[PDB]
């Protein structure tokens, strides 16, 4: 990761390229969404809200997805803050990545021309006694229901259509995602 | 980990995002609760109390659980310091993480809309002779009794009900947690 | 990774070789194209577009290949930024590396004399049920079709011929790549 | 580990260095040779810093090497500052030893804290003579531990031998009754 | 790597030993030649040519060999940059390292007295179907043909004799290397 | 390791704890004695001698043992430098750690009250032909004899008694170390 | 540890022209030593360089590179044997300038024939064995030149492992005199 040095009268600022982008209100989601990445992104969003609560925050997504709880934390932080969050899909947006891609401000969710978006039902695992397996299955079904509800509210599609589309791995191009309502427009060069 | 450069009349300073949040009296608890994390949290709380003893302290919780003793250390530190400690649940607060969520000041425990909390009896393990297994089992049962007692005192629910509900994994939504007494009210978006 | 203290005027700051080359709009791609490398490349491209929207960027490529999605992200960032990007093939540009080599500005794609390029169909895997295998096969076939279409557009050659040539591993010298259309001219030594 | 900015000195510390400035030494990990060396260095530096003020030892550790604990005990007893010991979380094995090794009347424990006292662990392997030597050494180490604990708690060596035969878990109130600590820090 | 400190007219500045040598345009190649080392060497060469395009560059080679692609990338970069590149053999220069040993400018290819050089035919491997093995074998033979051609041009020696001496491992002393043509003169101690 | 602030009259200097201890001529031997640790100790002793050849050097020992050659290098550096070296046994001094403990200046070797000193014959191993096993055994016996000679010189005890006592692992307390001659006096607490 | 006046301890020793060779002699260590030697030659080409040797050995090529760098530079190189010097380490100990190779009183040195390996066809094994014999011949020739000893005697003593103490190093010509304490 390269280092960027900026010279002022007061002193030297040694950014790394991600921090330099963050100076311009760019947050990069470019890895699997685990607890650490979600915590870092939440802290970045909160700091960007503090610095100025009126300008727009830009979120760049290139990730295979990850934890549902981490994605929900990011979604809650995005919806809670006053400034609008523009979501731009570079490369891939899968599982939780697509959920966060759809979570941007209306009229402000973008994707690069040959970017790929994948929607599917969450993965999980149950092990042990029958009662414990039942508890785990109930939890995962509740989580899937919540995700389908949010996606229906945020994309304008019926809950049944999203249930049918998310049964298997559905791969959508930028045009298909625009037609599906996941993104708002493709960014022409 | 991103780096934040903040300009002030005193000069320009380079922060990382977590220390920048700590400047605003915000403590991030976002990993498995082991000895090192609990030590860091206790140190941060003690320093925040030292800086000044009247403003609020904010604890953001996103953890799957961890050691019971580390969580007890964190809870005791929270209860011992004069400034009020607000707890906000980000994402998931499970096992001792949910226990620390209820440890916040009354009227100041928060949770995000699509956040989840999970309460269950503690785990453990015993190996060796029958007497050793008896000792370990007595220890784990006493730990469960202490946890249940603290939860009953902080949530207002009967010890028997918390005993029944923590028998298995209990997943609660923010509204279910509020009606159960774990949190005070959910954070409405603004 | 040697450091360099050479800077103008004050000359106090020290750079590593890659950061110093970044100031000269030199971007090095000397490893497999995964998500981390692609994200770094995209950030560097955006930073260089911000620094000056008119001057050209220099992209030295030496990569066995990598993720198709990462290469697509790099390709979109290259084709989206206003400044032109020169692709210079160092050593081997194979798989997605050759795709990014053809992604440079028209008339601004170069290769060193004793350099090698390779083009082939994308690799992948499909495991599970028959339906899942069908879905994965459809996805990989569509990815190959999109890659072939982009290569045909950027090389001016029929997609039938590219499909025929990408069936197996096709190794081309710098002159053969020039005749094929992936590059524009071979950088003769001084 | 977060970085801390002190506004009264416009100078930056890490949280552990900031605590050590206030004469706070944290024992929050397994006690091995490296950790004991660091603790002894911090204690000696603090003794150099001021001949009078108290040093604070915050203990949260499952235990560890007996020799490292003996080094820490010797350093604590040698230095003429009083060393207050506060039990944060767990004080088990050699950790409970250093808990009772603090200054009399200055041994504190958090309300919901637990301590553990038990005989030291070890192992032997080889010929009969070597195993006999190892057993003699471990028995002498246990005897010295029991003697120091009986001296610093006021209870009989026989009772400590009986209670430390197995794993003895004590609450803060039970540790107060036993004699390891002096009183429990009540919250404000 | 020890830190190295000098007092200049601009004050006292410190370097690591390799950065200090790079200040005097000394480039050290002292490990296996993979894509990372090749990327670093190419970056250093480009930086040195940008700093001053007339002065000489020095390449101290102590390498057991490496990838053919990385070595060819370094060779192309050396032959492309305007400043001359002196090459000095320290210890061992084997396989691709010996190829990079001959890459230096004529009259500026040195070697330490009791140093050893060794030329190989390139290693490789093939796996899969008969067609895939055919393609891999063709690629390896063409790579060896290119290596032999470049070696013949730089050392001024017949291609057939290079084939003969390259079929098996060929250890050469500094005097034998000088007589063969890989180096120009042995560095007599002074 | 923690960082401390110093110089209450100056306040601007901060050192790591071992650098701060090295300022007062305190050298810590608190790990297994290998080549790197011995090199660091020797370099520290040389620097301390260079800074002031009159003042005394302090060596703190807490080590289970280590290589015979590295400890012998430490012994040589201790015995060659003009300034006196005081040795204090913190915790344990076993194997060659006790040898270095006895290596201190006459009348200036101290041990803590509850400190254990262990003396035993050196370990080793031989694997190979009969001649190689004989060579290795002869070397091990020679180095044991050298250790016994030095220990007898610095302890005043007959070499037969050392041979008998070092047959097995002999654990001694501080009082028994003083009676045996390893240390000069036990550091009584203040 | 950090030495304050701030420099790391090895940097501080390098300021006094003291070069420490205290690890296995591989390519990385050889490159570091060569670079340090070149810098010390450049910084002041008239004073003397001190090399401290404590190593079990390593690569023959790395040791030969270090030997060549020592011989080529104009300023002289005193070698002081701290602890052990084995295989290539003893060779570099002998590489010191005349009258200025040192060894601590109870230090130990080792001389033995280089270790190697061969695997594959008969021709490849023959090539590897020929190279190993040539390398041993070169090592023996340089040792005979630098110790004033006959080639045959060095060959005989090097056959098996040969432990030499400081006094045996003295009468063997490996070191020039033992460093008496003062």
């Amino acid at each position: 990761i390269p280092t960027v040095i900026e010279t002022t009268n007061r002193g030297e600022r040694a950014y790394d390229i991600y921090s330099r982008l963050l100076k311009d209100r760019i947050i990069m989601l470019g890895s699997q969404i685990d607890d650490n990445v979600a915590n870092s992104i939440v802290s970045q969003l909160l700091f960007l809200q503090a610095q100025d609560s009126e300008k727009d925050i830009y979120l760049y997504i290139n990730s295979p997805g990850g934890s549902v709880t981490a994605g929900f934390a990011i979604y809650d932080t995005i919806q809670h803050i006053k400034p609008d969050v523009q979501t731009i899909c570079i490369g891939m947006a899968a599982s939780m990545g697509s959920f966060l891609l759809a979570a941007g401000a209306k009229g402000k969710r973008f994707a690069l021309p040959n970017a790929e978006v994948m929607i599917h039902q969450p993965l999980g695992g149950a092990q042990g006694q029958a009662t414990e397996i039942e508890i785990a299955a109930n939890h995962i079904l509740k989580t899937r229901e919540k995700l389908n509800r949010i996606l229906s509210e945020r994309t304008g599609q019926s809950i049944e259509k999203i249930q049918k589309d998310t049964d298997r791995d559905n791969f959508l191009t930028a045009e298909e995602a625009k037609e599906y309502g996941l993104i708002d427009e493709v960014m022409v060069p | 980990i991103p780096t934040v450069i903040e300009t002030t009349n005193r000069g320009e300073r380079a922060y990382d995002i977590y220390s920048r949040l700590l400047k605003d009296r915000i403590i991030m608890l976002g990993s498995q609760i082991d000895d090192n994390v609990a030590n860091s949290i206790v140190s941060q709380l003690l320093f925040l109390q030292a800086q000044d003893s009247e403003k609020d302290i904010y604890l953001y919780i996103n953890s799957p659980g961890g050691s019971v003793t580390a969580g007890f250390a964190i809870y005791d530190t929270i209860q011992h310091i004069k400034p009020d400690v607000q707890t906000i649940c980000i994402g998931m607060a499970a096992s001792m993480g949910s226990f620390l969520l209820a440890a916040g000041a009354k009227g100041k425990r928060f949770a995000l809309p699509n956040a989840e909390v999970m309460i269950h009896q503690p785990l453990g393990g015993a190996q060796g002779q029958a007497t050793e297994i008896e000792i370990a089992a007595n220890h784990i049962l006493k730990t469960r009794e202490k946890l249940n007692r603290i939860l009953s005192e902080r949530t207002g629910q009967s010890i028997e009900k918390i005993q029944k509900d923590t028998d298995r994994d209990n997943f609660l939504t923010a509204e279910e947690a509020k009606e159960y007494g774990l949190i005070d009210e959910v954070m409405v978006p603004e | 990774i040697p450091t360099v203290i050479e800077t103008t005027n004050r000359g106090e700051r020290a750079y590593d070789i890659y950061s110093r080359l970044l100031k000269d709009r030199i971007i090095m791609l000397g490893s497999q194209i995964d998500d981390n490398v692609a994200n770094s490349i995209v950030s560097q491209l955006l930073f260089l577009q911000a620094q000056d929207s008119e001057k050209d960027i220099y992209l030295y490529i030496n990569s066995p290949g990598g993720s198709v999605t990462a290469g697509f992200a790099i390709y979109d960032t290259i084709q989206h930024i206003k400044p032109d990007v020169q692709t210079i093939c160092i050593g081997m540009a194979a798989s997605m590396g050759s795709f990014l080599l053809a992604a440079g500005a028209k008339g601004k794609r170069f290769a060193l004399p004793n350099a090698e390029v390779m083009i082939h169909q994308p690799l992948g895997g499909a495991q599970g049920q028959a339906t899942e295998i069908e879905i994965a096969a459809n996805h990989i076939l569509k990815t190959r079709e999109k890659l072939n279409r982009i290569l045909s557009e950027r090389t001016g050659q029929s997609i039938e011929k590219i499909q025929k040539d990408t069936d197996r591993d096709n190794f081309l010298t710098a002159e053969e790549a020039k005749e094929y259309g992936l590059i524009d001219e071979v950088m003769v030594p001084e | 580990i977060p970085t801390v900015i002190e506004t009264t000195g416009e100078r930056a510390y890490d949280i552990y260095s900031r605590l050590l400035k206030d004469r706070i030494i944290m024992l929050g990990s397994q006690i091995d040779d490296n950790v004991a060396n660091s603790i002894v260095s911090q204690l000696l530096f603090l003794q150099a810093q001021d001949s009078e003020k108290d040093i604070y030892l915050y203990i949260n550790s499952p235990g560890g090497s007996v020799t490292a604990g003996f080094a820490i005990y010797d350093t604590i007893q040698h230095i003429k500052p009083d060393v207050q010991t506060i039990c944060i979380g767990m004080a088990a094995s050699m950790g409970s030893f250093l808990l009772a090794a603090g200054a009399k009347g200055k041994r504190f424990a958090l309300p919901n804290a637990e301590v553990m006292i038990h005989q030291p662990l070890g192992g032997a392997q080889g010929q009969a003579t070597e195993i006999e030597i190892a057993a003699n050494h471990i028995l002498k180490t246990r005897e010295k531990l029991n003697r120091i604990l009986s001296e610093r708690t006021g209870q009989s060596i026989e009772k400590i031998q009986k209670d430390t035969d197995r794993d003895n878990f004590l609450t803060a109130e039970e540790a107060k009754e036993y004699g390891l600590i002096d009183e429990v820090m009540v919250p404000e | 790597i020890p830190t190295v400190i000098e007092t200049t007219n601009r004050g006292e500045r410190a370097y690591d030993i390799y950065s200090r040598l790079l200040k005097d345009r000394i480039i050290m190649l002292g490990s296996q030649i993979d894509d990372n080392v090749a990327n670093s060497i190419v970056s250093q060469l480009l930086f040195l040519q940008a700093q001053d395009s007339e002065k000489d560059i020095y390449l101290y080679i102590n390498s057991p060999g490496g990838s053919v692609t990385a070595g060819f990338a370094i060779y192309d970069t050396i032959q492309h940059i305007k400043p001359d590149v002196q090459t000095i053999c320290i210890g061992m220069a084997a396989s691709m390292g010996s190829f990079l040993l001959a890459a230096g400018a004529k009259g500026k290819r040195f070697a330490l007295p009791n140093a050893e050089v060794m030329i190989h035919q390139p290693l490789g491997g093939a796996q899969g179907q008969a067609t895939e093995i055919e393609i891999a074998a063709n690629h390896i033979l063409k790579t060896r043909e290119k290596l032999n051609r470049i070696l013949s041009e730089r050392t001024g020696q017949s291609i057939e004799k290079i084939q003969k001496d390259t079929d098996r491992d060929n250890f050469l002393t500094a005097e034998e290397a000088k007589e063969y043509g890989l180096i120009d003169e042995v560095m007599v101690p002074e | 390791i923690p960082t401390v602030i110093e110089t209450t009259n100056r306040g601007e200097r901060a050192y790591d704890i071992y650098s701060r201890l090295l300022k007062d001529r305190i050298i810590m031997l608190g790990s297994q004695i290998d080549d790197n640790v011995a090199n660091s100790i020797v370099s520290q002793l040389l620097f301390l001698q260079a800074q002031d050849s009159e003042k005394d050097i302090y060596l703190y020992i807490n080590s289970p043992g280590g290589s015979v050659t590295a400890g012998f290098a430490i012994y040589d550096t201790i015995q060659h430098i003009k300034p006196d070296v005081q040795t204090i046994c913190i915790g344990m001094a076993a194997s060659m750690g006790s040898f270095l403990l006895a290596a201190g200046a006459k009348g200036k070797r101290f041990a803590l009250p509850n400190a254990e000193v262990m003396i035993h014959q050196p370990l080793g191993g031989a694997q190979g032909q009969a001649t190689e096993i004989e060579i290795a055994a002869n070397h091990i016996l020679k180095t044991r004899e050298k250790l016994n000679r030095i220990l007898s010189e610095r302890t005043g005890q007959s070499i037969e008694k050392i041979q008998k006592d070092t047959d097995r692992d002999n654990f001694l307390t501080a009082e028994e170390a003083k009676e045996y001659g390893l240390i000069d006096e036990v550091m009584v607490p203040e | 540890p950090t030495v304050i006046e701030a420099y790391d301890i090895y940097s501080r020793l390098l300021k006094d022209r003291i070069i420490m060779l205290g690890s296995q002699i591989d390519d990385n260590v050889a490159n570091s030593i060569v670079s340090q030697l070149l810098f010390l030659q450049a910084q002041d080409s008239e004073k003397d360089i001190y090399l401290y040797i404590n190593s079990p050995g390593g690569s023959v090529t790395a040791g030969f590179a270090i030997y060549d760098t020592i011989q080529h530079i104009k300023p002289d190189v005193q070698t002081i044997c701290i602890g052990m010097a084995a295989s290539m380490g003893s060779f570099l100990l002998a590489a010191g300038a005349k009258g200025k190779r040192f060894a601590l009183p109870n230090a130990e040195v080792m001389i033995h024939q280089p270790l190697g390996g061969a695997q594959g066809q008969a021709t490849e094994i023959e090539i590897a064995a020929n190279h190993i014999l040539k390398t041993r011949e070169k090592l023996n020739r340089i040792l005979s030149e630098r110790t004033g000893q006959s080639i045959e005697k060095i060959q005989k003593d090097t056959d098996r492992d040969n432990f030499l103490t400081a006094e045996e190093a003295k009468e063997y010509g490996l070191i020039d005199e033992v460093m008496v304490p003062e």
Binding site: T8, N9, R10 | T7, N9 | - | - | - | - | -
Partner: protein, 68 residues
């Protein structure tokens, strides 16, 4: 517009608010354009032509020369 805004914001981070509050007007100088540089060359050439004409030397500079 954005360039002026960001330069003004950066100026606030280098001077005290009460110092900038007492300034009557803070003016941002825009970068010179192509035609502005051409006019600057024209004005300097006119000044030089006057100064050489007072010495009775007549000089004219073509448009291509001025552009170069």
């Amino acid at each position: 517009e954005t360039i002026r805004k960001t330069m003004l914001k950066e100026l606030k981070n280098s001077f005290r608010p009460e110092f900038l509050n007492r300034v009557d007007d803070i003016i941002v100088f825009h970068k010179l354009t192509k035609e502005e540089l051409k006019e600057i060359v024209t004005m300097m050439v006119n000044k030089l032509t006057n100064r050489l004409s007072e010495q009775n030397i007549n000089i004219i500079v073509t448009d291509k020369a001025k552009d170069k």
